[PDB]
Design a protein around this ligand. Structure first.
Ligand SMILES: COc1cc(Nc2ncnc(-n3c(Nc4ccccc4)nc4ccccc43)n2)cc(OC)c1OC
Length: 272
C-alpha cells in the first residue's frame, strides 16, 4: 500500500470538523461532520485498544478498490492515531430506519421495488468485481436525500480469488440473514449474498420488520432444513415473493445472479 505521505486518500485531521454523532459502539464512533468546512461527510473513529488499527483500516483499503455510484464512497483516511475513515454522507440514514419514518411509511410498492433494484444494481457491481459483502441487510443500506440507496459497511467484504471465502470456525453471523452453507460450513460466495438479498427484500416490503416473524434462530434453521422458507410477508406482491424464493434455493449455484435480480426488479418497477 502507498505510504501515507503519497496516498491520495490521507488528509490532515485539521480538515475535519465533527458535528453530530450518528453512532457509538464497542469499537468506536461514527459522526456527521464537515470536510474543509463545506462538504458534509461521515467520520468513523476507532476506539484505541478496542481492535487492531490494521483490521480497522482494512475496510478502507478495500473501499479504495470498490468505487461505484451505488456503493458508499470512501472519502479519505487519517492513518495517524486516532484513526479515522471518512466517507460519503447519506442524509436519510439506514434503510431499516428510514422505512419506519413518516416518509418511509408512505412509500409506494413502486418506490420500494425501485430501491430494491438499486440495491441489486450495487451488488451486481460487487459481483462482477469478484468481491462478496457478507453483511448484506437493510441495516447496511444507506438512503440519500433524493431517496436513492447505496451499499455500506464493507467490514466483512472480501475479494474472492477462487469461487469462495471460508470463515473461521469460531466466526458467528446473523442466522436469519445468512445462507445455510455459510452458517453450516463457513463457506461464503456471491451466492450467499444473493440469499441475504432475498431476506433484505422482506425487510423492504414490511418496512423494516425482523425476518421470520415469531421464530427463534433454531426454529428458522429447523424449518429451512424441512424445505420451508419464510412465510409470505403481509401485503407482499406475489411476484416479489417468488423472486425472493429464487434467492433461497437449496443449491447456491441455482440462485440467480445479481444482474438478473436487477433486471427483474427494474421490470417490476417500470410495470408499477
Ligand atoms: C445508520 O444511521 C444513520 C446514518 C446516517 N448517515 C450516514 N452516511 C454515511 N455513512 C454512515 N455510517 C457509516 N458509513 C460507512 C462506514 C464504513 C464503510 C461504509 C460506510 N457507518 C456507520 C455506523 C453507524 C451509524 C452511521 C454510519 N452514516 C445519517 C443518520 O441520521 C442523520 C443516521 O441515523 C442516525
Amino acid at each position: 500500500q502507498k505510504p501515507w505521505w503519497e496516498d491520495e486518500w490521507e488528509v490532515p485531521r485539521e480538515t475535519l470538523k465533527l458535528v453530530e454523532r450518528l453512532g457509538a459502539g464497542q469499537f468506536g464512533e461514527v459522526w456527521m461532520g464537515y470536510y474543509n468546512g463545506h462538504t458534509k461527510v461521515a467520520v468513523k473513529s476507532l476506539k484505541q485498544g478496542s481492535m487492531s488499527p490494521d483490521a480497522f483500516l482494512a475496510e478502507a483499503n478495500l473501499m479504495k478498490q470498490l468505487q461505484h455510484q451505488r456503493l458508499v464512497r470512501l472519502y479519505a483516511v487519517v492513518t495517524q492515531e486516532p484513526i479515522y475513515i471518512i466517507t460519503e454522507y447519506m442524509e436519510n440514514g439506514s434503510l431499516v430506519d428510514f422505512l419506519k419514518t413518516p416518509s418511509g411509511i408512505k412509500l409506494t410498492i413502486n418506490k420500494l421495488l425501485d430501491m430494491a433494484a438499486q440495491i441489486a444494481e450495487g451488488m451486481a457491481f460487487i459481483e462482477e468485481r469478484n468481491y462478496i459483502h457478507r453483511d448484506l441487510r437493510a441495516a447496511n443500506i444507506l438512503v440519500s436525500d433524493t431517496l436513492s440507496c447505496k451499499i455500506a459497511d464493507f467490514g466483512l467484504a472480501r475479494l474472492i480469488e477462487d469461487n469462495e471465502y471460508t470463515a473461521r470456525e469460531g466466526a458467528k453471523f446473523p442466522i436469519k440473514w445468512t445462507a445455510p452453507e455459510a452458517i453450516n460450513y463457513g463457506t461464503f460466495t456471491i451466492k450467499s449474498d444473493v440469499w441475504s438479498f432475498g431476506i433484505l427484500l422482506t425487510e423492504i416490503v414490511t418496512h423494516g420488520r425482523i425476518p421470520y416473524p415469531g421464530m427463534t434462530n433454531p426454529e428458522v434453521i429447523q424449518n429451512l432444513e424441512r424445505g420451508y422458507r419464510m412465510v409470505r410477508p403481509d401485503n407482499c406482491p406475489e411476484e416479489l415473493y417468488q423472486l425472493m424464493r429464487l434467492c433461497w434455493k437449496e443449491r447456491p449455484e441455482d440462485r440467480p445472479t445479481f444482474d438478473y435480480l436487477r433486471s427483474v426488479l427494474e421490470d417490476f418497477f417500470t410495470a408499477t
